[PDB]
Amino acid sequence: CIIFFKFDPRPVSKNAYRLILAANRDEFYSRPSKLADFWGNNNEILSGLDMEEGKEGGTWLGISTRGKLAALTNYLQPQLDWQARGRGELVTHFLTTDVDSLSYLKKVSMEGHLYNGFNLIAADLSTAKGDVICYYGNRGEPDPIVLTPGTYGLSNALLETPWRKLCFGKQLFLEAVERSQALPKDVLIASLLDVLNNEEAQLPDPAIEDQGGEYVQPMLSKYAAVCVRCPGYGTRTNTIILVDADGHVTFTERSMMDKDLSHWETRTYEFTLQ
Ligand SMILES: [Cl-]
């Protein structure tokens, strides 16, 4: 997976963005999924949904109109514990409750050892109270942290781990934002989808080889790009989330459909926070 996001809780102007987010979901093409749409008690949650048997309803990225957002990435491991809890519930359980992001991540860190490796972003979006973005991963430091405003990158290492794909993609993300963020939001979205589909592998990457060990060796040539194109595994979903100063949300999701890489479906939802 890989996520880039700029976060500015006190925007200086009227049409600035409190959040610009661009995320790729890398997964085996066999895993069933549902395209983004509104669900929950009051149709108040927006996200895709995993449909793996025994894991239905999980998700990797979502936003609620109540002003909540969270995202998860897997920690690249040479081996997997198959008896542990699914990680799909970490994002879902945040979007379906009323806990503040920092308090939720503190609960998760007490239970972090029951999952395979994961990184977790949880965010409170409040036009009035002020935005908060926190981060916790069960393979890094035990205590969740409150992030200062800025541009962040997160992949299958920890937050800001200097993988070359993360550094290079973050450079493209900043260039796209500086290039077109003052233009209509549609061109910014197109610029970021172009970044998310950049397939230039950034190699050699000793950090990826060391962490992934033997499992990543046959994937390496393709794994070290923003957009991963491996045999039966890679970038299936591009997701752009924008929140401007006044609270207008734009949620775009381009999804691979036929698994022939020529059939794609893109859904965009424009709405407003409460
Ligand atoms: Cl259809």
Side-chain angles (χ1 to χ4, degrees), residues 72-82 84-92:
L72 183 137
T73 64
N74 297 353
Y75 192 77
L76 175 70
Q77 284 172 192
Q79 186 57 51
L80 216 70
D81 177 9
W82 293 80
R85 295 175 184 178
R87 291 161 289 192
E89 68 188 349
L90 296 165
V91 166
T92 295

Side-chain angles (χ1 to χ4, degrees), residues 67-82 84-128 130-177 179-220:
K68 289 192 136 189
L69 173 148
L72 183 137
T73 64
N74 297 353
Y75 192 77
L76 175 70
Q77 284 172 192
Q79 186 57 51
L80 216 70
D81 177 9
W82 293 80
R85 295 175 184 178
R87 291 161 289 192
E89 68 188 349
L90 296 165
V91 166
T92 295
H93 287 170
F94 180 68
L95 299 175
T96 59
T97 66
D98 63 319
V99 189
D100 64 289
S101 57
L102 182 62
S103 283
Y104 182 77
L105 291 192
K106 274 136 157 219
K107 170 160 98 220
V108 175
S109 63
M110 298 307 194
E111 331 199 284
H113 51 80
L114 314 191
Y115 305 85
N116 290 268
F118 71 85
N119 308 271
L120 184 58
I121 296 292
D124 307 321
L125 305 172
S126 190
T127 325
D131 304 317
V132 178
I133 305 187
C134 308
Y135 161 72
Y136 164 78
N138 71 340
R139 292 284 180 274
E141 295 299 347
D143 294 316
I145 57 169
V146 185
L147 302 181
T148 61
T151 300
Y152 287 86
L154 169 63
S155 193
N156 306 114
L158 311 180
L159 181 71
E160 288 289 320
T161 311
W163 285 7
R164 290 190 64 169
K165 68 177 285 174
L166 180 47
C167 285
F168 171 85
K170 186 161 163 179
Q171 183 212 289
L172 303 178
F173 175 88
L174 286 166
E175 288 176 357
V177 168
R179 166 172 65 245
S180 76
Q181 71 168 323
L183 310 174
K185 84 187 175 191
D186 287 271
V187 72
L188 172 59
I189 284 166
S191 293
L192 291 171
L193 295 169
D194 158 58
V195 171
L196 286 177
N197 281 100
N198 181 287
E199 302 176 23
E200 311 185 43
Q202 300 300 304
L203 287 166
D205 194 327
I208 290 173
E209 282 178 289
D210 184 80
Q211 189 189 328
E214 299 93 346
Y215 171 62
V216 75
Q217 284 289 307
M219 323 199 302
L220 192 63

